[PDB]
RNA sequence: CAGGAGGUUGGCUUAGAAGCAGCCAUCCUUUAAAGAGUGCGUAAUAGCUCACUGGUCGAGUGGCGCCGCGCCGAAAAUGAUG
């Protein structure tokens, strides 16, 4: 009987020097740095927060795999998300073209809160506040 | 006490209250009395117990519900009585047991002695934990801290003398 | 910490209580001990 | 601040229809017991599913709506959870085992109403 | 007293915000009403209070446009007092 704990990496690295520490060795876990690991399955998908069922078994079985990030990340990441290096005020180009707007969210909706049928109509709400464009 | 009025059941002991002092209710082993005040002239009642006010004033109004909740814990102490627990950290140092006082080693560099009143009440079940119990509410609170008031705090370490639902904070000092 | 005005409760967390007189502030923090008497 | 509304619009969203019951299911965070509570858009769909306007609020705002006061639940916590806004003919099966299945007294139930009458508490959740 | 339904799981930083590290964000499902998520915080988290509530319970509770009277701010030099 081994409990498991919510977690999640960051998106797009693979290093693991706090992640894979005492972050989970405080609880329960076994070997770590996973750079080998965690780049085969971060590469192929990812930029827009990606959270995959965490287990900590003995890692033996091969993450890679890849769960579809969810709505208002993968809706709101390919504008560049450029600004930020100073002060937040939703500058640095933050126009995202509503027509790439659709295209980000397009058919990539499967799991929400029981549903959504389009995303780009009512999710956008929360995708450009959260990003800044009001 | 409350935005309206309140009932109080009544089981095991009696009342009376006659002598206008303060009422009683004692259980097995309870005669625990309260010294309530004059008017707000309290009701003798069936197997529940109802209180006054004659206007609302700030007067009658405050002593309104300091009038119930002082009878209302002290019909519910002298059938099983109170108890406060009392936890103790450290680094090997524990209570004993050699009369019916207790002794603790924390830097009179052998012995510490504190005796309890009339509700005697001393009882180890571990290996240095104690708790205290009794009739009262009033004095097994003091008792209990008077308890604690020998090496009270634990300001940059963990040491010292705890009660059980107390969260007491730490901070860094050389390095860490 | 006695000042003499400067009884603005700061650390948002704070209460402001009278007895026997005088007048106390009380946060959840040591470095706000206010009395103003 | 709620005088005028609120109750013009929890009762309309409780008496869209009159078979309604009761619910009550409370600690963890948002939306994986909105996965029972909201996939009562699966089991059902968008219903006022207990859309919850209060109660002694809605116990004596639903004389304005009249649906013939149900008044079961003045004990333990009372949802009016309005199950007849979307299709209340199987969705009691449905919603009781969403918290059957789950930790100790998930959802607990207090009165329903057989579109006509009210229904018993104890022949509610059979 | 009882309860806090997880797509709210960063944007730089992801070494880490998942309101509760350093920056504004002023949407939606749904229900005990919603927490654009006020506070204690460390390695994020872990959790706790209500700043929301249904329950519980039931009728004087949160501020003021202003006045009447009072309180702290107020320490001497032969023994005191209107």
């Given at each position: 009987?081994?409990?498991?704990?919510?977690?999640?990496?960051?998106?797009?690295?693979?290093?693991?020097?706090?992640?894979?520490?005492?972050?989970?060795?405080?609880?329960?876990?076994?070997?770590?740095?996973?750079?080998?690991?965690?780049?085969?399955?971060?590469?192929?998908?990812?930029?827009?927060?990606?959270?995959?069922?965490?287990?900590?078994?003995?890692?033996?079985?091969?993450?890679?795999?890849?769960?579809?990030?969810?709505?208002?990340?993968?809706?709101?990441?390919?504008?560049?998300?450029?600004?930020?290096?100073?002060?937040?005020?939703?500058?640095?180009?933050?126009?995202?073209t509503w027509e790439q707007v659709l295209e980000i969210a397009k058919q990539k909706m499967?799991?929400?809160?029981?549903?959504?049928?389009?995303?780009?109509?009512?999710?956008?709400?929360?995708?450009?506040?959260?990003?800044?464009?009001? | 006490?409350?935005?309206?009025?309140?009932?109080?059941?009544?089981?095991?002991?009696?009342?009376?209250?006659?002598?206008?002092?303060?009422?009683?209710?004692?259980?097995?082993?309870?005669?625990?009395?309260?010294?309530?005040?004059?008017?707000?002239?309290?009701?003798?009642?069936?197997?529940?117990?109802?209180?006054?006010?004659?206007?609302?004033?700030?007067?009658?109004?405050?002593?309104?519900?300091?009038?119930?909740?002082?009878?209302?814990?002290?019909?519910?102490?002298?059938?099983?009585?109170?108890?406060?627990?009392?936890?103790?950290?450290?680094?090997?140092?524990?209570?004993?047991?050699?009369?019916?006082?207790?002794?603790?080693?924390?830097?009179?560099?052998?012995?510490?002695?504190?005796?309890?009143?009339?509700?005697?009440?001393?009882?180890?079940?571990?290996?240095?934990?104690?708790?205290?119990?009794?009739?009262?509410?009033?004095?097994?609170?003091?008792?209990?801290?008077?308890?604690?008031?020998?090496?009270?705090?634990?300001?940059?370490?963990?040491?010292?003398?705890?009660?059980?639902?107390?969260?007491?904070?730490?901070?860094?000092?050389?390095?860490? | 910490?006695?000042?003499?005005?400067?009884?603005?409760?700061?650390?948002?967390?704070?209460?402001?209580?009278?007895?026997?007189?005088?007048?106390?502030?009380?946060?959840?923090?040591?470095?706000?001990?206010?009395?103003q008497g | 601040r709620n005088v005028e509304l609120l109750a013009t619009l929890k009762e309309?969203?409780?008496?869209?229809?009159?078979?309604?019951?009761?619910?009550?299911?409370?600690?963890?965070?948002?939306?994986?017991?909105?996965?029972?509570?909201?996939?009562?858009?699966?089991?059902?769909?968008?219903?006022?599913?207990?859309?919850?306007?209060?109660?002694?609020?809605?116990?004596?705002?639903?004389?304005?709506?009249?649906?013939?006061?149900?008044?079961?639940?003045?004990?333990?916590?009372?949802?009016?959870?309005?199950?007849?806004?979307?299709?209340?003919?199987?969705?009691?099966?449905?919603?009781?085992?969403?918290?059957?299945?789950?930790?100790?007294s998930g959802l607990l139930q207090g009165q329903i109403l057989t579109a006509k009458d009210?229904?018993?508490?104890?022949?509610?959740?059979?």
């Amino acid at each position: 009987v081994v409990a498991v704990v919510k977690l999640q990496l960051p998106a797009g690295k693979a290093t693991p020097a706090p992640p894979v520490g005492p972050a989970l060795g405080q609880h329960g876990a076994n070997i770590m740095e996973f750079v080998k690991a965690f780049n085969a399955a971060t590469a192929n998908m990812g930029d827009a927060i990606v959270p995959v069922e965490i287990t900590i078994y003995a890692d033996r079985s091969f993450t890679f795999v890849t769960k579809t990030p969810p709505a208002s990340y993968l809706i709101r990441k390919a504008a560049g998300l450029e600004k930020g290096a100073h002060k937040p005020g939703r500058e640095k180009v933050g126009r995202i073209t509503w027509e790439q707007v659709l295209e980000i969210a397009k058919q990539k909706m499967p799991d929400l809160n029981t549903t959504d049928l389009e995303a780009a109509a009512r999710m956008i709400a929360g995708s450009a506040r959260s990003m800044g464009v009001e | 006490s409350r935005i309206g009025r309140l009932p109080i059941p009544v089981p095991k002991g009696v009342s009376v209250e006659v002598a206008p002092g303060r009422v009683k209710v004692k259980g097995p082993k309870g005669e625990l009395e309260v010294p309530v005040s004059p008017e707000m002239r309290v009701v003798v009642e069936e197997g529940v117990v109802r209180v006054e006010r004659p206007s609302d004033e700030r007067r009658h109004k405050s002593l309104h519900g300091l009038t119930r909740t002082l009878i209302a814990n002290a019909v519910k102490g002298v059938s099983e009585g109170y108890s406060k627990e009392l936890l103790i950290k450290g680094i090997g140092y524990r209570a004993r047991l050699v009369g019916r006082a207790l002794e603790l080693t924390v830097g009179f560099s052998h012995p510490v002695v504190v005796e309890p009143p009339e509700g005697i009440t001393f009882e180890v079940p571990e290996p240095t934990r104690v708790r205290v119990s009794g009739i009262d509410k009033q004095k097994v609170g003091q008792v209990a801290a008077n308890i604690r008031a020998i090496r009270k705090p634990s300001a940059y370490h963990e040491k010292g003398i705890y009660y059980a639902g107390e969260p007491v904070r730490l901070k860094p000092g050389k390095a860490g | 910490m006695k000042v003499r005005a400067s009884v603005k409760r700061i650390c948002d967390k704070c209460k402001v209580i009278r007895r026997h007189g005088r007048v106390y502030v009380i946060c959840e923090n040591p470095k706000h001990k206010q009395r103003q008497g | 601040r709620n005088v005028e509304l609120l109750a013009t619009l929890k009762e309309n969203l409780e008496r869209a229809q009159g078979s309604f019951f009761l619910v009550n299911y409370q600690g963890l965070p948002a939306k994986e017991t909105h996965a029972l509570r909201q996939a009562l858009k699966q089991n059902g769909a968008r219903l006022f599913v207990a859309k919850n306007t209060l109660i002694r609020l809605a116990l004596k705002e639903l004389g304005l709506p009249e649906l013939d006061g149900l008044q079961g639940p003045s004990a333990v916590v009372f949802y009016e959870d309005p199950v007849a806004a979307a299709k209340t003919l199987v969705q009691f099966a449905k919603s009781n085992p969403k918290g059957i299945p789950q930790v100790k007294s998930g959802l607990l139930q207090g009165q329903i109403l057989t579109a006509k009458d009210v229904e018993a508490l104890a022949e509610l959740p059979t």
